[PDB]
Design a protein around this ligand. Structure first.
Ligand SMILES: Nc1nc2c(ncn2[C@@H]2O[C@H](COP(=O)(O)OP(=O)(O)OP(=O)(O)O)[C@@H](O)[C@H]2O)c(=O)[nH]1
Ligand SMILES: Nc1ncnc2c1ncn2[C@@H]1O[C@H](COP(=O)(O)OP(=O)(O)OP(=O)(O)O)C[C@H]1O
Ligand code: SF4
Ligand SMILES: [Mg+2]
Ligand SMILES: [Zn+2]
Ligand SMILES: [Zn+2]
Ligand SMILES: [Zn+2]
Lengths: 158, 495, 97, 86, 512, 39
DNA sequence: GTGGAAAGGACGAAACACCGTGCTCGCAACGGCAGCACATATACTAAAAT
DNA sequence: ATTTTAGTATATGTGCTGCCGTTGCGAGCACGGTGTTTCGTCCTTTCCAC
RNA sequence: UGCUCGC
């Protein structure tokens, strides 16, 4: 699978749409599970445990969805969830479980839950100066000046 | 009605204030941006391209094509600079030692200088004294550098500051995570254990985990210099009005005018003679374009860093074409002529064009003895006397003499060759036109380029000069022969 | 130019300059090495200290502080080359008085 | 090989990412209004020392009518060193 | 610190004037210097230098110190000039936590720098007499109560007091009185029995003399840090955890300083008894909350002890590091998209990683992930390790490992925010100056109405104000107004990120 | 210095350029001033 | 003596980097003042035994 | 508690690999200029058949 | 750039 083939590669072409759909569906499932756990409000420990989703559970859910024809292994969904973690949207915890319906890792099970971001977008990105690509060439007197800036002009006009 | 503005002032230069320019100042000074790596057009006229190298908006180098910025010919065009933007910053080879020094002076975390408040106040008081000389400035810089290199921890943020040294060519290594023979610090242990994923995916990282110190590429060095407090700038012995620490790392290259880069149009073949600076700038533009192409196409990091190092080396060669730490595989094939080579050497600007230069109104001839002349007199041939002219101003005393000189013309030996009027500065050749009418219209104040006649003070020298007596001012007497004749008693000074 | 076939002129070498210095003839040295060899008139801006053209400074976008100045052409070439080397010479002009 | 460019890149290259809209609420608007009030009230404060006007053309009878009058705060010379007394 | 100097120059010019901002910038750039050399280098008269120095030291922007030969040297505090921008946030938080009385108190303290308690209560009464009407007068009793309530909470602190001249070296007066600070009477208000009623601006001996007060910006910074941590933990787990950590931080405020890696540990019993009764929460629910917060991979709190039931402690430096990480990932996401943010979080979690490993772990196709990596390299968001096989450091025979340094990236982001606020202030001043003609026109046409408001006010002056050509220019006036409003809002909102980055940079240093 | 004088094209301070010359022109320093009638 | 189609030879032309392949040498041209690495010597200081 | 040994800590002091210089001015001449390695477009000339 | 010369 490493030198050729793969669940994502189709005829030597990376399927960005496929991984995007996988990420969106997994995030929607995790968000719905977390919402149900929050609305259950039975007990904080029980809420956290129900918000957690095992890799096998979400893998079976994706298989039940059947978006693509190619068979997706458990480690494929694990890598998709890891990419979602790298997106700053979900959180994974390794708990101790000897054997169960997953049986993937020896004595360890990975549980994933949708988590809200830490802080809202900062104030720097709300200003055109923070997102400027030519910010280095900024100067008081010159061709690129804050007085005659086009970015701030369009931002104030909008 | 009319505003009073001064025409000309007798301005005299007092002193030259050296300094540096920021990239913004480089953009402001330059007129156009050079982005095309080619020189001439595809058509058979081979006109220079627009917004590229050899563009006539940065001056002119040909007698027929005038400058586009200022509508003047080659003799009147002073030249205009240009600015070329670099995708990745590069270390300035001239200030690279200064860059290393500043990095040793300041902290690598909070950008503050490694000096306590008491030492800061002491150095400020020692620097505030008037009449500070260059030697005192360099000595103070040496002392402050030593006292900063003595310390190892920062008193402002508490971060560790290891040794900063030069590895390879134009590469700086800071030994932040140094090996500690005693009990190791938590920082170095965390740094060593942070390579877990790298070791898992690449086992070769584990044996080479040692010697993995910080590499201060131009990006990080520029980012650090941009955050240096202005209070610590005078402590670095650098004048704040002259320049800033961020100016030591160059991001824009000032391409000089065409006056410094003369181009010869060799119509005998399908090519032109260009200086090495034009080729270096062309290669730099090509390297910038290649780096941009690799960034767009998503190339590997190894080749990206190789292109960056090649760009740094080419910029250094453009500045100084004679380096030492150049790799054998990166060594140039031929020999180029950079600015440093143009400045230093026997044929440099200082020794070949500033201290000793060539002048006109001079001749060179073989000498022959003649004892019948006085010791303060020297015989000049008629042929040379007709060529070397002296500008005499028409006054109330020598008017009748200059009239006869003009009447004689450039053929008879006692005479002149050119007449410059007082009102208009348009010279008039005496070989053409009615010389009698010119003599009758000689106004006071006119310049007459008279021939070398008897009584004119003239310098006589032998090129090998040991003492001052090797060159003396004598009185010229014209003789029909073709040699410089003087009294043999003056042979001992000239040797 | 250098040679006779190129219609060149004689060069006042370094030792000749040393002899002229020893004699103390400042005006003769000035006439030889500046007036008769590479005399030129440049335009310097009194505000930024840079070289202008036709009585105009492109750096400051003004022409009030631009003034003419006599100079050897080799000195102007050296100043331009130094500006190309990021070694910017800033000339602070003043009245001859 | 990379292609040659005839014209320089634009002075302000376009970006597909736009700045996030500012936070809204009563707090942000109140802070904005308070900052504007501070800007308006701190210039008339005696601490805001203006540039001393000079080179009066003439003296006139209307000088007393147009004479700018403003109360001046008295600094505590006990804490301030002696070198700043007028 | 060129951007910091530019921002301080803009602030001092907008707030104090021109002849004083030059002295301030000179002090910031050159450091501590005697008065005569400052006057010589600046190029202005001596009286203007003295006035600038006094008006700067009044607002606690500069300090004076004695040295050898009895010379006095003045040093400016760039940090204080930067904190000057946080005045609206200080006023908003003191209006939120307290009544409008404390709001006016803090406003007067910030606008005057140093004042006495009698003076500030008199000014607050005079200003609040305008808020209410119908003959109701403002007494000094409630104002003094609010002032002492602000004092015991360390929001307002007594300025350094000059030592007694008679007891300490009686004789020749020194050039500087050498003000010292005492922690005994730092928050002790004087007993002032005198009361009064504020005047309604009709326009028709000091017991607390020598005792000056000021705003304790350290307390405001601590309160802002606590609010940020509470908001973060609320967005993470729930509002119940936010209330728990708010109660814990409120308990820790008094028993801890402003700079410590860990706070004083608290037990579950005191947290339970100190929690507001509005929450129907039992002891076991609090125990579960604490033990689940201790297991958080963000390490907001920690056990750090088992005695007294559930003993727990709060990690402040770890929370600030997490907040800085969140700010950095958010700015990366908003500047380069979500995929670049994914790559950034990947290269942040994995301390060292290469291009192929990044492509394998992020599932981003080639020719795009390397592009974003190089873009982040060009903006100093990360540094390469460059582990060499040989000391030659040749690129063809070495490994390049990507690694994000949070400290350097945070410093670069703080510099970027400083320059951003400077550019915003410059744009606002430019828009104000370019439209000052229409501003004066509108001021005149509105002062026509502002004059003779009631005395001799005929109705024939109301239909001629809009008759002038100012009516089509009212659109440009509204555009200028909304642009200035948005610029000020952005300048205020960037100050939050500035505070976060500055706190992260401050709490990670040792100052040894 | 002499070298910078030679480079910049100005007369060197050593030699004949150490002193300055003045013209013995017929003049009257501090000439009589016209009185002001209005002031 | 002629022609429609075919090949090949010459001159622009674009990708890449002065050398076909990846190798590969010698010699310093002679002092001479900066140095930076190492190295290492010795003493100062503090921990340990009596 | 005090004298003796261990370490560390910096400074100093002897090297060894760097960079910088090496009279002056004059007059001739010969040669070669960046190109070249392979790909392709164009033009022309000549193997057989008429 | 090379080299032969001229003192
Ligand atoms: N091989 C060779 N190199 C030369 C020749 N002439 C000049 N050069 C090179 O060019 C440099 C000197 O150039 P100059 O002699 O000033 O050229 P120039 O006489 O100004 O050229 P024109 O302007 O065409 O007269 C030297 O460093 C030489 O390497 C020559 O005839 N043969
Ligand atoms: N390389 C040189 N540098 C300076 N001057 C030179 C040089 N070569 C020749 N000259 C000039 O030529 C003169 C040398 O002549 P000199 O050595 O005194 O006599 P000579 O050549 O030995 O004649 P004899 O062999 O004694 O008949 C002196 C000098 O001005
Ligand atoms: S162009 Fe304008 S908006 Fe962009 S960085 Fe410069 S000043 Fe800011
Ligand atoms: Mg001889
Ligand atoms: Zn021109
Ligand atoms: Zn530091
Ligand atoms: Zn100028």
């Amino acid at each position: 699978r490493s030198v050729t083939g793969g669940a994502w590669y189709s005829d030597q072409d990376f399927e960005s749409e496929f991984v995007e759909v996988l990420n969106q569906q997994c995030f929607k499932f995790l968000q719905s599970k977390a919402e149900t756990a929050r609305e259950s409000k039975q007990n904080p420990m029980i809420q956290r445990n129900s918000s957690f989703a095992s890799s096998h559970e979400v893998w079976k859910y994706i298989c039940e969805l059947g978006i693509s024809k190619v068979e997706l292994s458990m480690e494929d969904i694990e890598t998709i969830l890891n990419t979602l973690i790298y997106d700053g949207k979900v959180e994974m915890t390794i708990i101790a479980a000897k054997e169960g319906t997953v049986g993937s890792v020896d004595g360890h099970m990975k549980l994933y839950r949708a988590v809200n971001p830490i802080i809202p977008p900062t104030g720097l990105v709300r200003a055109p100066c923070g997102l400027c690509p030519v910010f280095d060439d900024c100067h008081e007197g010159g061709e690129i000046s804050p007085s005659n800036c086009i970015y701030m002009t369009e931002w104030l006009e909008f | 009605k009319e505003q009073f503005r001064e025409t000309d002032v007798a301005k005299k230069i007092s002193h030259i204030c050296f300094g540096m320019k920021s990239p913004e100042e480089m953009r402001q000074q330059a007129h156009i941006q050079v982005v095309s790596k080619n020189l001439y057009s595809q058509d058979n006229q081979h006109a220079p391209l627009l917004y590229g190298v050899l563009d006539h908006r940065m001056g002119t180098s040909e007698k027929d094509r005038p400058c586009e910025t200022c509508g003047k010919n080659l003799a009147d065009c002073l030249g205009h600079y240009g600015y070329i933007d670099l995708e990745l910053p590069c270390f300035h080879v001239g200030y690279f030692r200064a860059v290393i020094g500043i990095l040793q002076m300041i902290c690598k975390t909070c950008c503050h200088i490694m000096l306590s408040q008491e030492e800061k106040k002491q150095f400020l008081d020692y620097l505030k004294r008037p009449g500070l000389t260059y030697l005192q400035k360099r000595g103070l810089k040496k002392k402050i550098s030593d006292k900063c290199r003595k310390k190892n921890i920062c008193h402002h943020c508490g971060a560790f500051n290891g040794t900063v040294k030069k590895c390879g060519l134009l590469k700086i290594i800071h030994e932040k995570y140094k090996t500690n023979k005693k009990v190791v610090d938590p920082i170095v242990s965390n740094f060593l254990q942070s390579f877990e994923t790298a070791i898992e995916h690449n086992k070769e990282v584990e044996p080479l985990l040692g010697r993995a110190q910080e590499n201060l590429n131009p990006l990080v060095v520029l980012n650090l210099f941009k955050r240096i407090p202005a209070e610590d700038v005078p402590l670095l012995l650098m004048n704040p009005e002259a320049g800033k620490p961020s100016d030591l790392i160059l991001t824009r290259l000032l391409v000089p005018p065409l006056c410094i880069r003369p181009s010869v149009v060799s119509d005998l073949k399908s090519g032109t003679n260009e200086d090495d600076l034009t080729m270096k700038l062309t290669e730099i533009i090509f390297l910038n374009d290649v780096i941009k192409k690799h960034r767009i196409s998503g190339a590997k990091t190894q080749m990206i860093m190789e292109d960056w190092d090649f760009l740094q080396l080419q910029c250094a060669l453009y500045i100084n074409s004679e380096l030492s730490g150049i790799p054998l595989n990166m060594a140039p094939k031929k020999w180029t002529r950079g600015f440093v080579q143009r400045l230093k050497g026997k044929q440099g600007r200082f020794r070949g064009n500033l201290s000793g230069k060539r002048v006109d109104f001079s001749g060179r001839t073989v000498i022959s003895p003649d004892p019948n002349l006085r010791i303060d007199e020297v015989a000049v041939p008629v042929h040379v006397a007709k060529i070397l002219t002296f500008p005499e101003k028409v006054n109330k005393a020598n008017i009748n003499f200059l009239r006869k000189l003009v009447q004689n013309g450039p053929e008879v030996h006692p005479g002149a060759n050119f007449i410059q009027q007082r009102h208009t500065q348009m010279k008039r050749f005496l070989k053409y036109g009615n010389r009698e009418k010119m003599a009758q219209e000689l106004k006071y104040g006119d310049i007459v380029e008279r021939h070398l006649i008897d009584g004119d003070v003239v310098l006589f020298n032998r090129q090998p000069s040991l003492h001052k007596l090797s060159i003396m001012a004598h009185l010229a007497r014209v003789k029909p022969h073709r040699t410089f004749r003087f009294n043999e008693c003056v042979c001992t000074p000239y040797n | 130019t250098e040679g006779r076939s190129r219609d060149g002129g004689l060069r006042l070498g370094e030792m000749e300059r040393d002899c002229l210095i020893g004699y103390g003839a400042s005006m003769l040295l000035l006439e030889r090495l500046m007036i008769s060899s590479d005399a030129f008139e440049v335009d310097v801006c009194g505000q930024c200290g840079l070289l202008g053209y036709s009585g105009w400074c492109h750096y400051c976008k003004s022409s009030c502080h631009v003034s003419s100045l006599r100079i050897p052409y080799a000195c102007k070439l050296l100043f331009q080359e130094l500006q190309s080397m990021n070694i910017i010479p800033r000339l602070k002009l003043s009245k001859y008085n | 090989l990379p292609d040659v460019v005839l014209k320089p890149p634009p002075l302000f290259p376009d970006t597909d990412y736009k700045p996030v809209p500012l936070k809204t609420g009563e707090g942000e608007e109140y802070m904005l209004a308070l900052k504007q009030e501070l800007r308006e009230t701190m210039k008339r404060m005696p601490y805001f020392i203006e540039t001393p006007e000079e080179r009066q053309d003439i003296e006139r009878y209307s000088k007393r009518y147009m004479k700018v009058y403003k109360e001046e705060w008295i600094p505590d010379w006990r804490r301030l060193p002696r070198e700043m007394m007028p | 610190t060129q951007a910091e100097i530019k921002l301080c120059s803009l602030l001092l010019q907008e707030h104090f004037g021109e002849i004083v901002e030059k002295i301030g910038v000179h002090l910031i750039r050159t450091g501590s210097q005697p008065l005569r050399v400052i006057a010589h280098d600046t190029g202005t008269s001596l009286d203007q230098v003295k006035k600038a120095l006094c008006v700067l030291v009044q607002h606690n922007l500069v300090s004076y110190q004695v040295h050898k030969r009895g010379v006095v040297e003045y040093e400016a505090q760039c940090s204080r000039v930067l904190r000057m921008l946080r005045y609206p946030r200080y006023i908003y938080t003191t209006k939120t936590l307290y009544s409008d009385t404390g709001e006016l108190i803090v406003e007067e303290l910030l606008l005057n720098g140093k004042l006495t308690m009698s003076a500030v209560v008199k000014k607050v009464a005079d200003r609040l007499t305008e808020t209410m009407e119908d003959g109701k007068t403002m007494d000094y009793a409630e104002v003094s109560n609010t002032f002492v309530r602000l004092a015991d909470t360390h929001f307002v602190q007594r300025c350094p007091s000059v030592p007694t001249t008679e007891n300490s070296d009686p004789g020749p007066p020194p050039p500087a009185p050498t003000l010292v600070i005492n922690e005994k009477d730092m928050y002790l208000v004087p007993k002032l029995s005198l009361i009064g009623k504020g005047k309604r601006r009709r326009s028709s001996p000091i017991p607390d003399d020598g005792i000056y007060w000021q705003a304790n910006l350290d307390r405001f910074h601590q309160h802002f840090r606590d609010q940020a941590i509470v908001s973060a933990v609320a967005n993470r787990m729930d509002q119940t955890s936010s209330e728990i950590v708010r109660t814990m931080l409120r308990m820790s405020e008094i028993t801890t300083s402003s700079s410590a890696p860990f706070t004083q540990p608290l037990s579950s019993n005191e947290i339970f008894r100190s929690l507001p009764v509005g929450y129907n929460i039992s002891k076991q629910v609090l125990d579960q909350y604490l033990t689940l917060l201790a297991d958080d991979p963000l390490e907001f709190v920690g056990k750090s002890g088992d005695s007294g039931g559930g003993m727990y402690v709060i990690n402040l430096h770890k929370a600030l590091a997490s907040l800085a990480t969140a700010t950095l990932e958010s700015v990366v996401q908003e500047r380069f998209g979500s995929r670049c943010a994914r790559i950034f979080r990947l290269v942040l979690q994995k301390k060292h990683i290469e291009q192929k490993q990044v492509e394998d772990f992020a599932m981003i196709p080639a020719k795009e992930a390397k592009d974003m990596l190089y873009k982040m390299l060009s903006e100093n968001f990360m540094s390469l390790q460059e582990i060499p096989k040989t000391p030659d450091h040749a690129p063809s025979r070495t490994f390049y490992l990507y690694t994000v340094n949070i400290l350097s990236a945070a410093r670069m982001l703080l510099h970027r925010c400083y320059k951003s606020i400077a550019n915003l202030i410059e744009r606002r001043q430019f828009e104000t100056k370019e439209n000052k003609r229409l501003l004066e026109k509108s001021q005149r046409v509105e002062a026509i109405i502002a004059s003779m408001q009631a005395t001799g006010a005929e109705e024939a002056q109301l239909q001629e104000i809009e008759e002038m050509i100012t009516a089509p220019e009212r659109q440009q006036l509204e555009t200028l107004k909304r642009n200035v409003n948005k610029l000020d809002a952005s300048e205020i909102q960037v100050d939050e990120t500035i505070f976060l980055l500055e706190s992260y940079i401050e709490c990670t240093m040792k100052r040894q | 210095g002499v070298s910078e004088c030679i480079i910049m094209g100005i007369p060197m301070n050593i030699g004949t350029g150490l002193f300055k010359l003045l013209h013995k022109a017929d003049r009257d320093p501090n000439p009589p001033k016209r009185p002001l009638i209005f002031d």
